[PDB]
Amino acid sequence: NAMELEQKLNLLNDLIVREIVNPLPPPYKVGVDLGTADIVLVVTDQEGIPVAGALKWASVVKDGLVVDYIGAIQIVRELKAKVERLLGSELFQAATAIPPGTNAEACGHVVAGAGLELVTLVDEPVAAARALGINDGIVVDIGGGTTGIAVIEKGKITATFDEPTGGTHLSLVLAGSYKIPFEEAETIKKDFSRHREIMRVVRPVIEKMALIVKEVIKNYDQTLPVYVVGGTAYLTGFSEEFSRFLGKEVQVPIHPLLVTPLGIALFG
């Protein structure tokens, strides 16, 4: 599974970034991931191999309230079309995440509103999990605006949480530290050249993050493996820095940002 997941994520990263498709024969599965910092649309064959994907940077969830619901539909619409020109065909339906911390099924309604018959809603925990293909473990989706702890065992979301921290505080904590406009700082944070030198300054937030999880795991089985996914974990060494403050080493996959999105698509 580790090898599989890694290869699929590297693929999906290219399908997205170099805007090309994987010419697998239909039927396809589509997934839309609604989010604090980005919207992602993902297509796969019936075995979950990536076929297509697109991503827009977009704050249409602020605190879980779809605060730009129309903006959402515009984005999903523009994504659906990009993927559609790039792919042979057109798409009819998708699964979605109703992100936790949120009357937020306007989710489905963005998907329906972009012209996709809703296949189902998913919990990000459920998705995240399936993508890792991990039955028993702990998942720490560290999104842009909230993190979202969760506990699966036997093959069930046996406990779940979430707490208003993520990539943005980092970028902000950097913005503040460096004394730089927030966009200016986000452009930096994201550049891979600078992780080395942006690290020390942004470490404090990671400490905080880890100890918050430590706490929530201070009631749950320690046998449990620990998987840190989500775009915030794109910081090189994030794995290490976090693996310390928490207490146990963590697994962060090759393209952290993509894990949930790929997972949702697995439902459609």
β-bridge pairing 93-97 and 117-122? parallel
For the sheet with 117-122, list strands across it: 50-57, 38-44, 29-33, 93-97, 117-122
Rank residues 105 and 221 by Cβ distance to ligand ATP and give the closer one.
105
Task: For the segment 167-206, give every residue that binds ligand ATP (CB under 6 A).
Answer: 167-168, 171, 189-190
Q: What are phi and psi of 227, to 5 degrees?
A: -125, 120
Q: Which stretch binds ligand ATP (CB under 6 A): 16-24, 44-52, 115-123, 225-233?
A: 225-233
Residue 48 is assigned to a ligand binding site: no
Residue 8 is assigned to a ligand binding site: no
Rank residues 99 and 108 by Cβ distance to ligand ATP and give the closer one.
99
Rank residues 79 and 257 by Cβ distance to ligand ATP and give the closer one.
257
d(CA 2, CA 253): 8
The reply on whether position 110 binds ligand ATP by CB under 6 A is: no
Q: Which amino acid is at 115?
A: G
Half-sphere exposure of 130 (CA within 13 A, CB side): 17
The reply on whether position 8 binds ligand ATP by CB under 6 A is: no
The reply on whether position 137 binds ligand ATP by CB under 6 A is: no
Residues preceding discontinuities in the chain at C–N > 2.5 Å? 102
The reply on whether position 235 binds ligand ATP by CB under 6 A is: yes
DSSP-assigned letters across all residues of 211-231: HHHHHHTTTS-SS--EEEESG
The reply on whether position 162 binds ligand ATP by CB under 6 A is: no
d(CA 267, CA 258): 15
Q: Which amino acid is at 228?
A: V
The contact mask relative to ligand ATP for 139-158 (x = CB under 6 A, - = no) is --x-xxx-------------
Residue 189 is assigned to a ligand binding site: yes
Rank residues 48 and 148 by Cβ distance to ligand ATP and give the closer one.
148
The reply on whether position 234 binds ligand ATP by CB under 6 A is: yes
The contact mask relative to ligand ATP for 60-99 (x = CB under 6 A, - = no) is ---------------------------------------x
d(CA 127, CA 17): 22
Number of Cβ atoms within 10 Å of the Cβ of 94 = 30
Asked if 237 contacts 104 with a C-beta cutoff of 8 angstroms, the reply is no
Q: Which residues are annotated as a binding site?
A: 36-37, 144, 186, 189-190, 231
Site residues for ligand ATP per CB under 6 A: 33, 35-38, 99, 124, 141, 143-145, 167-168, 171, 189-190, 230-232, 234-235, 257, 260
